[PDB]
Ligand binder design. Structure first.
Ligand SMILES: Cc1cn([C@H]2CC[C@@H](COP(=O)(O)OP(=O)(O)OP(=O)(O)O)O2)c(=O)[nH]c1=O
Ligand SMILES: [Mg+2]
Ligand code: NA
Ligand code: NA
Ligand code: NA
Ligand code: NA
Length: 324
DNA sequence: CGGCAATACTG
DNA sequence: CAGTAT
DNA sequence: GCCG
């Protein structure tokens, strides 16, 4: 798939990112969908009218697209606040979002050294800060493989029947991965229970897990672990690792969800909603139960990812095609 | 105009 | 709840 | 930002 509009999307993304770090999330979501619509266009966009014929692109977006197309630049970029580069730096710290970045900025901080020496940091943020560079670079697929295998071997050592699947960008076939997303379950529908505690303690013992970010181990029904790992050996960097354990009945929906992409997911969930259904990482179900939240819908059994697509009347897409 | 995915921890 | 995260 |  060749993005015939790279010259466009490249500029649009700078703006999209600017709105994002400033907290203007809905406006930023709009650009993202516009940007993906452009990447998927069969040819390079050649006119305002044609740009408008594309869903996700309105008059405002079309103006910018044509300006970039015809001038090779977007003047709006020259007007982005000088605070944006700083807000981006701060929000690049895992555990710190736009609100925290803003707070730090207002306090006068402008560099990571400022944050290290004077900023108030949450436990997660302190970990995000010390591993800033490690976490910012995307690791080579080869390393993600090693990480995934490390987790699989440690788990299967407890039960060879356990299925361990690297999801996220690794599953979508990317060449580099921002982190490693591992999903675990068991066909018998019960042997997944209790694996969390044993897996984490096992990986901690061998020194693989170096820090925890999100992990409620007081909960035996715990399904997610967000932490930090590091392969043994010389020169290995620290990497983000997410581990999810789910009962077999939720395997298809968990696999679908954690494979993503994030945009592919919210788009698919939105489609589900229009068909009177609701899609979570747990299951596809009938429309959730005046005009208010209450009870979950009835679950629609889905043994495989294909089943989810089928019940949604959507053509099936391999993981590599959910790159959105 | 209001909605924009559905959900899971932390403190 | 506010914030951040998947 | 866009859509309905
Ligand atoms: C953050 C986020 C994530 N997801 C899903 C779908 C993706 C997986 C993994 O997320 P990740 O950030 O690793 O992304 P990933 O695709 O693995 O890309 P990286 O290489 O990790 O950045 O979770 C989502 O539905 N909504 C979200 O807001
Ligand atoms: Mg990932
Ligand atoms: Na359109
Ligand atoms: Na962050
Ligand atoms: Na992840
Ligand atoms: Na947080």
């Amino acid at each position: 798939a060749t993005n015939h509009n790279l010259h466009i999307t490249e500029k649009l993304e700078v703006l999209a990112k600017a709105y994002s770090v400033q907290g203007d999330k809905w406006r930023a979501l709009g650009y993202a969908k516009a940007i993906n619509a452009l990447k998927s266009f069969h040819k390079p966009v050649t006119s305002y009218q044609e740009a408008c014929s594309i869903p996700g692109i309105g008059k405002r977006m079309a103006e910018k697209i044509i300006e970039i197309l015809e001038s090779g630049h977007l003047r709006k970029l020259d007007h982005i606040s000088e605070s944006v580069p700083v807000l981006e730096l701060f929000s690049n710290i895992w555990g710190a979002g736009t609100k925290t970045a803003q707070m730090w900025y207002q306090q006068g901080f402008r560099s990571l050294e400022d944050i290290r020496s004077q900023a108030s940091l949450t436990t997660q943020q302190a970990i995000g800060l010390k591993h800033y560079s490690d976490f910012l670079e995307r690791m080579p697929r080869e390393e993600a493989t090693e990480i995934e295998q490390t987790v699989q071997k440690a788990a299967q050592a407890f039960n060879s029947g356990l299925l361990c699947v690297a999801c996220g960008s690794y599953r979508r076939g990317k060449a580099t991965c921002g982190d490693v997303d591992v999903l675990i379950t068991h066909p018998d529908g019960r042997s997944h229970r209790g694996i969390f505690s044993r897996l984490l303690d096992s990986l901690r013992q061998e020194g693989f897990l170096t820090d925890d970010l999100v992990s409620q181990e007081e909960n035996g029904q715990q399904q997610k672990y967000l932490g930090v790992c590091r392969l043994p050996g010389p020169g290995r960097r620290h990497r983000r690792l997410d581990i999810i354990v789910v009962p077999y009945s939720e395997f298809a929906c968990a696999l679908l969800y954690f494979t993503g992409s994030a945009h592919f997911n919210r788009s698919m969930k939105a489609l589900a909603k229009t068909k009177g259904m609701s899609l979570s990482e747990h299951a596809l179900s009938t429309a959730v139960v005046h005009g208010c939240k209450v009870g979950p819908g009835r679950v629609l059994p889905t043994p495989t990812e294909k089943d989810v697509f089928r019940l949604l009347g959507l053509p099936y897409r391999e993981p590599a095609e959910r790159d959105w």
